Amino acid sequence: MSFPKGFLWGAATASYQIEGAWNEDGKGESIWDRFTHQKGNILYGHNGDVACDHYHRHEEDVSLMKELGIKAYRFSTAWARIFPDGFGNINQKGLEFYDKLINELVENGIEPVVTLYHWDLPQKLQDIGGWANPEIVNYYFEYAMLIINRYKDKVKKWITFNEPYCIAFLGHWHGIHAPGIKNFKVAMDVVHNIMLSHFKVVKAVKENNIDVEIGITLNLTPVYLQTERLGYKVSEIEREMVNLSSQLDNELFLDPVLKGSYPQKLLDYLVQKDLLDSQKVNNMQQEVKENFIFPDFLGINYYTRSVRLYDENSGWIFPIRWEHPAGEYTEMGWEVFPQGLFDLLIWIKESYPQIPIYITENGAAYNDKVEDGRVHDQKRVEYLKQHFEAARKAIKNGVDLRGYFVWSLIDNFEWAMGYTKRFGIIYVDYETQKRIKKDSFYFYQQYIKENSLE
């Protein structure tokens, strides 16, 4: 046993992934609804208009959490349900739905780790700008406060954001996620606004002496060297050039968390390549350093490592390349490697002051097949075992890791992949919405039950 007291084992879901009911109860569409309605955005023309009927079968879903036995359930209060506009007028129907969900989560002893945002931004908020517009810093704020003041008696740990790297780069640079923007300056602006909102919420909680714990959740990609894997000798330029891409993937977000300033060298490199403005980076520095406040917790979402060997022959905006080491892979194409997470579990310890660190999302996707009314995924089980050990052996070695949340609960709308990629540990037959507990669901249940003490 290495996991400490209060080690928040859990499962994570996103509202738009399972909810549906995009127009019911006066609720306006999400960003994902508008993104998915447009052609060329999702495989096979999918959208979360219906999803898995999480609204109508919320009793069934809470029974699912009860069966899973997760000490905490990481869910996002769908912003658009509670606020169809996103602010101002508040819908008592969506408020009542989330009141019922939260009270029946509390009644069974499940700690609500409410992620105030898990990609389910209301459409009107996207029309006013999304996460690039600095006004959202207040809106989110008040929204969070209205949730917090409503549920501070029952919800104790709040997650400000989920994967600002994915919100900002997959969602706003690569465009595979909603709302499908493809820009790097907009991505940096999203980073700025997300960090400002996180610290504004932290400051507001601290000022009013609210007895809650507030932090931010990131996804961090470790680095391994193929040259060291090759058995050869690493050159200086190799590290000197892997550093920039690693800063893009690792340091760009952790530096404002505790240091309160952006990595200056990356901003200078972007300016020299005309990808970003020096006056803008200085203004971002000034705003961050004025608005910075040390948070309470940090969240980590680890999936895979990025094996990086030095070369100039990619043509990418950062002249490096990626390697494909031999090994097990998933339907998402991700290499399965535990030890990469270990790197982060030490690296953030070395580079930054003491910030409590949480893991909030980790899992693997596999093409599930119905067999005897059941689906089988042993590769998901093996992935989870490996990433369980990667943190257990670590916390034996003096790691301040705080909790691990498994992704996901039920097979559900996996964003641009549509329904083709299934991450959840519960099979849902889309025809009947029947719930079958996979071997991975049983494995997670057994792990939580066996490890966590009384």
Is 350 designated active site? no
Stretch 219-238: interaction string toward its own copies, x if CB under 8 A: -------x--xxx-------
**Which range of residues in 5-13, 17-25, 325-333, 342-350 is near its own copies by CB under 8 A?**
325-333
The answer to whether 162 is annotated as binding is yes
Provide the 10 A C-beta neighbour count for residue 306.
Answer: 18
**Beta strands 111-115; 157-162: pairing state:** parallel
Q: The tokens of 122 are what?
A: 């209301």
The answer to whether 358 is annotated as binding is no
Is 163 designated active site? yes
Number of residues that bind its own copies (CB under 8 A): 26
Beta bridge partners of 428: 435
- Residue 367 lies near its own copies (rule: CB under 8 A): yes
Nearer to its own copies by C-beta: 43 or 50? 43
What does each C-alpha distance from 148 to 99, 111, 115, 142, 214 come to in angstroms? 13, 14, 11, 9, 10
Peptide bond into 179 cis (omega under 30): yes
- Residue 370 lies near its own copies (rule: CB under 8 A): yes
- Residue 366 lies near its own copies (rule: CB under 8 A): yes
> Pick the catalytic residue: 19, 29, 163, 335?
163
Nearer to its own copies by C-beta: 1 or 43? 43
- Residue 328 lies near its own copies (rule: CB under 8 A): yes
Q: Distance between CA atoms of 142 and 192, rounded to whole angstroms?
A: 18
Considering only the C-alpha atoms of the chain, give the largest distance between any 2 of them, rounded to a whole number of Å: 64
Site for its own copies, residues 114 to 173, rule: CB under 8 A:
none
CB neighbour list of residue 124: distance below 8 Å, 6 or more residues apart: 28, 84, 85, 86
- Residue 333 lies near its own copies (rule: CB under 8 A): yes
Nearer to its own copies by C-beta: 32 or 83? 32
Do 5 and 402 contact (CB within 8 A), yes or no? no
Residue from 405, 408, 335, 406 nearest 368 by CA: 408
Among 277, 331, 400, 439, binds its own copies (CB under 8 A): 331
- Residue 182 lies near its own copies (rule: CB under 8 A): no
What does each C-alpha distance from 377 to 48, 353, 368, 433 come to in angstroms? 25, 40, 7, 19
Nearer to its own copies by C-beta: 235 or 283? 235
Q: Distance between CA atoms of 443 and 382, rounded to whole angstroms?
A: 10
Among 43, 50, 90, 317, binds its own copies (CB under 8 A): 43
What does each C-alpha distance from 168 to 151, 192, 322, 391 come to in angstroms? 28, 10, 21, 27
- Residue 313 lies near its own copies (rule: CB under 8 A): yes
Nearer to its own copies by C-beta: 190 or 416? 416
What does each C-alpha distance from 236 to 143, 149, 233, 242, 418 come to in angstroms? 49, 53, 10, 10, 43
**Which range of residues in 49-57, 250-258, 292-300, 330-338 is near its own copies by CB under 8 A?**
330-338
Do 194 and 130 contact (CB within 8 A), yes or no? no
- Residue 330 lies near its own copies (rule: CB under 8 A): yes
Nearer to its own copies by C-beta: 115 or 245? 245
Active-site residues, by number, are 163, 361
Residue positions forming the annotated binding site for substrate: 17, 118, 162, 303, 407, 414-415
Contact positions vs its own copies (CB under 8 A) = 40, 43-44, 226, 229-231, 311, 313, 323-333, 366-367, 369-370, 379, 420
